[PDB]
Amino acid sequence: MKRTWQPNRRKRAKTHGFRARMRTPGGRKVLKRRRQKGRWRLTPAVRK
Amino acid sequence: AVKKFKPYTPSRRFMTVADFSEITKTEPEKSLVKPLKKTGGRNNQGRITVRFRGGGHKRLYRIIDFKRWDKVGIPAKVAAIEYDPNRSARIALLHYVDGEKRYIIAPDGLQVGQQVVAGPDAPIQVGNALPLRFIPVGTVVHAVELEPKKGAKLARAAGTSAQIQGREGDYVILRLPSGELRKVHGECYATVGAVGNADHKNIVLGKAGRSRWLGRRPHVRGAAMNPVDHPHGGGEGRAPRGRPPASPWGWQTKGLKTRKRRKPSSRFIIARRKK
RNA sequence: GAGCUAGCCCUGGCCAGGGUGAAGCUGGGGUGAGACCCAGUGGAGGCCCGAACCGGUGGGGGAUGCAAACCCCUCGGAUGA
RNA sequence: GAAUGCCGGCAUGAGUAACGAUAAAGAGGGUGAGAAUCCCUCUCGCCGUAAGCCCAAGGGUUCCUACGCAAUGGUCGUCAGCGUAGGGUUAGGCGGGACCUAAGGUGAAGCCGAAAGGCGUAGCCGAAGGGCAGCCGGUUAAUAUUCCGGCCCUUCCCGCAGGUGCGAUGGGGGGACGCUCUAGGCUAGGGGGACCGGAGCCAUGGACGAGCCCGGCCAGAAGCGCAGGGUGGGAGGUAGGCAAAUCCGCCUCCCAACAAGCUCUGCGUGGUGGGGAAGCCCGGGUGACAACCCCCCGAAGCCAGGGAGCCAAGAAAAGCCUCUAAGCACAACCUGCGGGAACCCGUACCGCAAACCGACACAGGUGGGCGGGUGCAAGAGCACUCAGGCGCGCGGGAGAACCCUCGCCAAGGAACUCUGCAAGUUGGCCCCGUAACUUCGGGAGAAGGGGUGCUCCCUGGGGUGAUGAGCCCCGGGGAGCCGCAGUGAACAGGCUCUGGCGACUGUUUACCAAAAACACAGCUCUCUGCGAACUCGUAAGAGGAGGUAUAGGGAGCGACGCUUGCCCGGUGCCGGAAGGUCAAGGGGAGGGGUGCAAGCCCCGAACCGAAGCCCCGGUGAACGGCGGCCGUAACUAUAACGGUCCUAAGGUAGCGAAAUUCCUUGUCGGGUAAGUUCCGACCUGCACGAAAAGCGUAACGACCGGAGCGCUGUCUCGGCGAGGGACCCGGUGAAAUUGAACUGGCCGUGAAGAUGCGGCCUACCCGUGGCAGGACGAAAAGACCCCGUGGAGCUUUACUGCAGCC
RNA sequence: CGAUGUCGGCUCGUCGCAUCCUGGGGCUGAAGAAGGUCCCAAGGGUUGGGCUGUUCGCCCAUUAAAGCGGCACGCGAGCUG
RNA sequence: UGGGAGAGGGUGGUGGAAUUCCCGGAGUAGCGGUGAAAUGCGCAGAUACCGGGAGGAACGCCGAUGGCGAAGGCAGCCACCUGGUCCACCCGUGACGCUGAGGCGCGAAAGCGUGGGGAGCAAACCGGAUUAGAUACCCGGGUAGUCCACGCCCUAAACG
RNA sequence: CCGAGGGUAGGGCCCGUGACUGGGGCGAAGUCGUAACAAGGUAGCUGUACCGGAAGGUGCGGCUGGAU
Numbered sequence A: 001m002k003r004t005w006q007p008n009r010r011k012r013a014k015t016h017g018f019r020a021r022m023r024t025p026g027g028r029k030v031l032k033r034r035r036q037k038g039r040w041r042l043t044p045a046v047r048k
Numbered sequence B: 001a002v003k004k005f006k007p008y009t010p011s012r013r014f015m016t017v018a019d020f021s022e023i024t025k026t027e028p029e030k031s032l033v034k035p036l037k038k039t040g041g042r043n044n045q046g047r048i049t050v051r052f053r054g055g056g057h058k059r060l061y062r063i064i065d066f067k068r069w070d071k072v073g074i075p076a077k078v079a080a081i082e083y084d085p086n087r088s089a090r091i092a093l094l095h096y097v098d099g100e101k102r103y104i105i106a107p108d109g110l111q112v113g114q115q116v117v118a119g120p121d122a123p124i125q126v127g128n129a130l131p132l133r134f135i136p137v138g139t140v141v142h143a144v145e146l147e148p149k150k151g152a153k154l155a156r157a158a159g160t161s162a163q164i165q166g167r168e169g170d171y172v173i174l175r176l177p178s179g180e181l182r183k184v185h186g187e188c189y190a191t192v193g194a195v196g197n198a199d200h201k202n203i204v205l206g207k208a209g210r211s212r213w214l215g216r217r218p219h220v221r222g223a224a225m226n227p228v229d230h231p232h233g234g235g236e237g238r239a240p241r242g243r244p245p246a247s248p249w250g251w252q253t254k255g256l257k258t259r260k261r262r263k264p265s266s267r268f269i270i271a272r273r274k275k
Numbered sequence C: 001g002a003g004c005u006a007g008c009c010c011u012g013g014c015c016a017g018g019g020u021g022a023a024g025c026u027g028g029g030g031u032g033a034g035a036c037c038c039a040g041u042g043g044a045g046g047c048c049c050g051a052a053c054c055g056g057u058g059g060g061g062g063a064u065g066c067a068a069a070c071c072c073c074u075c076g077g078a079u080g081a
Numbered sequence D: 001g002a003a004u005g006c007c008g009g010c011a012u013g014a015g016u017a018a019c020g021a022u023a024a025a026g027a028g029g030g031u032g033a034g035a036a037u038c039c040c041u042c043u044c045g046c047c048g049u050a051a052g053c054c055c056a057a058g059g060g061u062u063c064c065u066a067c068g069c070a071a072u073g074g075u076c077g078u079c080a081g082c083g084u085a086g087g088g089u090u091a092g093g094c095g096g097g098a099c100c101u102a103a104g105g106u107g108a109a110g111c112c113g114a115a116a117g118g119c120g121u122a123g124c125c126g127a128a129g130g131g132c133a134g135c136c137g138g139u140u141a142a143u144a145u146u147c148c149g150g151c152c153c154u155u156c157c158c159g160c161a162g163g164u165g166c167g168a169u170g171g172g173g174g175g176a177c178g179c180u181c182u183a184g185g186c187u188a189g190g191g192g193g194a195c196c197g198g199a200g201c202c203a204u205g206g207a208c209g210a211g212c213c214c215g216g217c218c219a220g221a222a223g224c225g226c227a228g229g230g231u232g233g234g235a236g237g238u239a240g241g242c243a244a245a246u247c248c249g250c251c252u253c254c255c256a257a258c259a260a261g262c263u264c265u266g267c268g269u270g271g272u273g274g275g276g277a278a279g280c281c282c283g284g285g286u287g288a289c290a291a292c293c294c295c296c297c298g299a300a301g302c303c304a305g306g307g308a309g310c311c312a313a314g315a316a317a318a319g320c321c322u323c324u325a326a327g328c329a330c331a332a333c334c335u336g337c338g339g340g341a342a343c344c345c346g347u348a349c350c351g352c353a354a355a356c357c358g359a360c361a362c363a364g365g366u367g368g369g370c371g372g373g374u375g376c377a378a379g380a381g382c383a384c385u386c387a388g389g390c391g392c393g394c395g396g397g398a399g400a401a402c403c404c405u406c407g408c409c410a411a412g413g414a415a416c417u418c419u420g421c422a423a424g425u426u427g428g429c430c431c432c433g434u435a436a437c438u439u440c441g442g443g444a445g446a447a448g449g450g451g452u453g454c455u456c457c458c459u460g461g462g463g464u465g466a467u468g469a470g471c472c473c474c475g476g477g478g479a480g481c482c483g484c485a486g487u488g489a490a491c492a493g494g495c496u497c498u499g500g501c502g503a504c505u506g507u508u509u510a511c512c513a514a515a516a517a518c519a520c521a522g523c524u525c526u527c528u529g530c531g532a533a534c535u536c537g538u539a540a541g542a543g544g545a546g547g548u549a550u551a552g553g554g555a556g557c558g559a560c561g562c563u564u565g566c567c568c569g570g571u572g573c574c575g576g577a578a579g580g581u582c583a584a585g586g587g588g589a590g591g592g593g594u595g596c597a598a599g600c601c602c603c604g605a606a607c608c609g610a611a612g613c614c615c616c617g618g619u620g621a622a623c624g625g626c627g628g629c630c631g632u633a634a635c636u637a638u639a640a641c642g643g644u645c646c647u648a649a650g651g652u653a654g655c656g657a658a659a660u661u662c663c664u665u666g667u668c669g670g671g672u673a674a675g676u677u678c679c680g681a682c683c684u685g686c687a688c689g690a691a692a693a694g695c696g697u698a699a700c701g702a703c704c705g706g707a708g709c710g711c712u713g714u715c716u717c718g719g720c721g722a723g724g725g726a727c728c729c730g731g732u733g734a735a736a737u738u739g740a741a742c743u744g745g746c747c748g749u750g751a752a753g754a755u756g757c758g759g760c761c762u763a764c765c766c767g768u769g770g771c772a773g774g775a776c777g778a779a780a781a782g783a784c785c786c787c788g789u790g791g792a793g794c795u796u797u798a799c800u801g802c803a804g805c806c
Numbered sequence E: 001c002g003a004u005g006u007c008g009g010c011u012c013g014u015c016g017c018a019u020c021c022u023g024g025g026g027c028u029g030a031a032g033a034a035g036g037u038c039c040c041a042a043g044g045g046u047u048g049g050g051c052u053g054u055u056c057g058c059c060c061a062u063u064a065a066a067g068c069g070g071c072a073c074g075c076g077a078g079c080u081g
Numbered sequence F: 001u002g003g004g005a006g007a008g009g010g011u012g013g014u015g016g017a018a019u020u021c022c023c024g025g026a027g028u029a030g031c032g033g034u035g036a037a038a039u040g041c042g043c044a045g046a047u048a049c050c051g052g053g054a055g056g057a058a059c060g061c062c063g064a065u066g067g068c069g070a071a072g073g074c075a076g077c078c079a080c081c082u083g084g085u086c087c088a089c090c091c092g093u094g095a096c097g098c099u100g101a102g103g104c105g106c107g108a109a110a111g112c113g114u115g116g117g118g119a120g121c122a123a124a125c126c127g128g129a130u131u132a133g134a135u136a137c138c139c140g141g142g143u144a145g146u147c148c149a150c151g152c153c154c155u156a157a158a159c160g
Numbered sequence G: 001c002c003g004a005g006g007g008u009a010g011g012g013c014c015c016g017u018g019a020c021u022g023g024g025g026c027g028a029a030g031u032c033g034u035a036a037c038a039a040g041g042u043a044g045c046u047g048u049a050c051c052g053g054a055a056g057g058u059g060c061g062g063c064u065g066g067a068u
């Protein structure tokens, strides 16, 4: 049947992407915590 | 003269539609339309603030002239009468001798080809706009400003009118469409006559799809819901109200008055509505 | 977190074929004039049969499955909310 | 040593289940260490509105080639979407950007919020919408509207020529629009040809033929032809289009007005450029100087912004055209021509799937376009087939039980069962015919029946063409022929009577309930005069609504018909300028502390003093409620009638053993051989009853009762047969579970149901196929029940607060 | 209570005997036939249907008879629901 | 042809009296009602009086034993549209007449549908009296309805 | 071919019968009230409407077949 993951590059970048994270107090904290933890990627990668 | 249908479907049994006999022009004046931004009852928060709205036919908003004191003394000819889906009244297309074109809501009996005009000296003829002070006591009028130069507010729905009961200083006394007795300032403009399309009240929508066409989504009784939803919600089996009948938000909905207490316009209300 | 689901907003798209035959229109009859009747034309409808499409009624299978809801037969809607 | 402990390792079940759609395989020849599994060939089968082809998303090198087979591949592997390497994606015209706006987002101005932030006109962003210039063929192992070939086109810059008041983010026009139905003419596509071109073929009885088989085109600029769309011309006035305006709008006059003209597309033709089959021979070559022609069918596509009808009344902005403003009129703009200029990103491959979403090469899910032929009334349905693509990544045998999917069945025919559950029956089209009731539509496909193939003869109308022929769509009449049977295969209603519920089409518990539930038109009550009520928000701001009482919110009821009675004492709501109570506050009789005192400080009565409450009214489609006992008639029985207690008032009409009736299978009647169900009645209604509506109601229903006809493997009562499994052999090889085990019956015993204790009985050791009585078998720290001064949802006249409102 | 699945049916039985029938008896208010009552006897047998979920029960038509009870109200790792 | 009388009919308009309610004023202890009473209303200021407003319905006098219409029925006043009828003249047609099964149309009141309207009145209904009872007669409330538009109903002591 | 008739299916009219139900006629001395006849103690009747154990009452309009 129709499962729950229906990938969509525009959706992905507009929802979890770098710019959406920056435009918000909580998104900036997300970037801050993932940097402090040393994540290799701070946001999902999408081809664009 | 609302039109009936033979019962060739269960819904065509009772469905009645307006007769459209007074309409003479079937597409609107491109100069005077703009797009009507549908809300679905959602406010700028995105939240439903008026339930059960949405999904009706597409509409273009026809700009209507509710000022009319815009063009005192300039006569206009009534060129067309048209269907307007944003209001119950029909609208008349005016060609002013200026060349300027405008929509008014179409009073009763208004004839295509006659002329109308606005101002302190206009004739007392159906379709003319005078300050309230200059319209004789007894005249049945529509499209009435509530405060001067603020725009026609009262008596705009199909069939409605206000009647001029008397004068008192700078104010006239109107019997509003609801039976209320109110003082409206005499410099307020009003239009001579009652609104047209008075058969509008006798339309029988006839089926449920009709309500959907008009943007009306189905309305759920609070007694069909659960406690988390409604004061009438819950119960094993059917259930009477079991408390004073109440809104989804808990206030009483059989009798409880809700006009603000100390509202300044109270000074200007002679008699609250009737019936 | 509404890329699942629910509702709404914007903009696009889709609905084989067959059936039934509303109003109106025309003509004919009718009458003081009418109502109205008949024929033809017409092609209405949360109209009918039925694919796609959308469903999920009954039964059977499946039950460490092909599948964390599937399969087969049957069945509902299919110009409309 | 135990924590259903944690991490890891390794056992057991077990060579067990399984190896993923039952579309299907066999053989020969190659290759190689090794082949059912890779390559080739022949035979067979499967899809063919796809299981074929082309886009979009998503994926991200999976594409092509060489060399590989440890692992991955449910077997094998020499093969592969796998390993290693190398190669491969070419654009002014395709898509996106340097263009436009949509919701929405963002946001100079501005507004609001302890902070973070929230709003917000313009403007900006935002597309699968608008706008904008490329078609055909060839080439590569792999890209091509991109390279190449042929023929077309767009914009930008500079120039020459001719023309013009040139000039805009400003004005206007236009862009610019719905649903259903639809005309003319075309194209796409398809069918036939006794015509044209072609390698061939004559079999097995016949045919050397008007034979079989194959093919008979595609693109094209100007010009022209056919079919359409768009569009009035001139003049005068002018105060409107937030400056101006010759434009636009408004008024007048004149002419043109089925037209025309101009303009713009579609189709055809068109210089020219391509393509070009079977067959045969080795993707190639030939065929071939290939031929490329006539007739017919014909779109849902094109002309298009076409036409008609309808109500629910159907985006914007730019490009473009026109107007003028600053300005400039040595400029500028328009037309024509010439030369130059033309950037960034995508382009491989998969794409109904082994490459996307489902942990898997997973029977599931995934938007758009093409989707051929024949027959079946039609069609995208169904059967078979073209092109093209496949046989589903374990096989080989056997021919048990049992299971699944399927076929048939003597006599009977629902006797099965909770239930005809299931499976039969019926089944398309044409014709005949068709009941109660009805809201006159319907009920209706009611029911029930007849017809249906093939051949010969005759003949009617519609399309094409010419009016004929020919092709083509519907037929009508007659005479025959064959079979068990003519919708001969495939796809395709079983019917009726009667009741309950709900008017109806719709909606719902994704994944145990589709319903009588929700919704629904319709009815009533109630609130709301607009900065409305109401809703979301601390606010600003929004929605309501660019609406205005024929409107909008809330609530119940639920088409329609006939109706909806009595109670206002309690609760709610509504009205009440009196009275009673009432907070801060006002007032300050009169006290108190301290100081020598002026004073300073504190308590403080009467009295004035809102809402709310009390109190007086009203109000039921507001919350709700609508009696008891006793007696009585000239047979009996029963009480129209009476008496009395009580209430705010004592349940009216209609209905009633009911979706409600406990006693209950009430009693009677019907249906049956027999009826706890059903239907019709009765009424002592445990415990109906009138908008939590009451009683009916045509039509409707995958709802729930009851009956009958038809027909049956449901059954008496089972039999046989098919295939996929099960079974045996080769390959690969799980699982939950498991204290250890050398694990029998009975009668007892035991924590009360013993393989394990006692006594007796029985029993050589180990398996394989089967069945399920036991191992209080597995699974799940019982969901029932209680317990915990555990938790959570929900209620209210429980307590206490809070928002909101007064 | 770290789970002993709970009514009825179906299927398959097996056991007790306080015997429904069939066999053997004594007494009888046993003339015969038929019946009553008790004794012995568990070998075998003990039907088909209507109603209801029913067990049970009532009813129809039969019968030699239409027995009662145990087996976790026998039997859901056997089915049904 | 020339005239006449008439509440004949339809539409529109429009005038004053009266009642009810509302507001202002003034004023106080009752008003109302009956056979008598009581319910009811009134110091929250009623009744009675003055002024202002709103709204609906019916038209006093004239008015009659009157007039008109086929009947049902028709009454302030005004305009318009329209029917019937009578008289005079003796001018025109030349029996063109009478009746009339069916048919069609009209048809008080009440009642029904859909809108509106609602002052007075008033079935139902509530209350107060009366009475043995009093589902009545009397009194206080009161909803349909009575009024308008359209559409039905088609009855009557529709009687002379 | 037609054809008595038989079968199947569905209609129409009539007769008989039916749990129960509706009123109707009738019947020496039943129960409740007293509606009508006198102004019958509320003049009566009337069509309609609603209500009521019952006769009846009441609304609206009509009649005199009403009285003084």
Ligand SMILES: *[C@H]1C[C@@H](CC(C)C)C[C@H]2CN[C@H](C(=O)N[C@H]3[C@H]4O[C@H](SCC/C=C\[C@H]3C)[C@H](O)[C@@H](O)[C@H]4O)[C@@H]2O1
Binding pocket: E003, E005, E006
């Ligand atoms: C039902 C009977 C109750 C008594 C009734 C309610 C009066 C008594 C319990 C006693 N134990 C049984 C039990 O609990 N059984 C459960 C079973 O669950 C499934 S079987 C399907 C569900 C039926 C019953 C459960 C409640 C398991 O597979 C079984 O092993 C057993 O756990 C009685 O139950």
Ligand SMILES: [K+]
Binding pocket: D784
């Ligand atoms: K329980």
Ligand SMILES: [Mg+2]
Binding pocket: A002
């Ligand atoms: Mg889904």
Ligand SMILES: [Mg+2]
Binding pocket: A006, C003
């Ligand atoms: Mg999605």
Ligand SMILES: [Mg+2]
Binding pocket: A006
């Ligand atoms: Mg999707």
Ligand SMILES: [Mg+2]
Binding pocket: A008, A009, A010, A011
């Ligand atoms: Mg995307």
Ligand SMILES: [Mg+2]
Binding pocket: A010
């Ligand atoms: Mg996208």
Ligand SMILES: [Mg+2]
Binding pocket: A008, A010, A011, A012
């Ligand atoms: Mg997206």
Ligand SMILES: [Mg+2]
Binding pocket: A014, A015, A020
């Ligand atoms: Mg976001």
Ligand SMILES: [Mg+2]
Binding pocket: A013, A014, A015, A016, A017, A018, A019, A020, A021
């Ligand atoms: Mg982002």
Ligand SMILES: [Mg+2]
Binding pocket: A025, D116
């Ligand atoms: Mg911050």
Ligand SMILES: [Mg+2]
Binding pocket: A028
């Ligand atoms: Mg910060």
Ligand SMILES: [Mg+2]
Binding pocket: none
């Ligand atoms: Mg990571």
Ligand SMILES: [Mg+2]
Binding pocket: A040
């Ligand atoms: Mg790094």
Ligand SMILES: [Mg+2]
Binding pocket: A016, A021, A030, A031, A042, A043, A044
């Ligand atoms: Mg992130």
Ligand SMILES: [Mg+2]
Binding pocket: B003, B004, B005, B006, B012, B013, B014, B015, B016
């Ligand atoms: Mg209708």
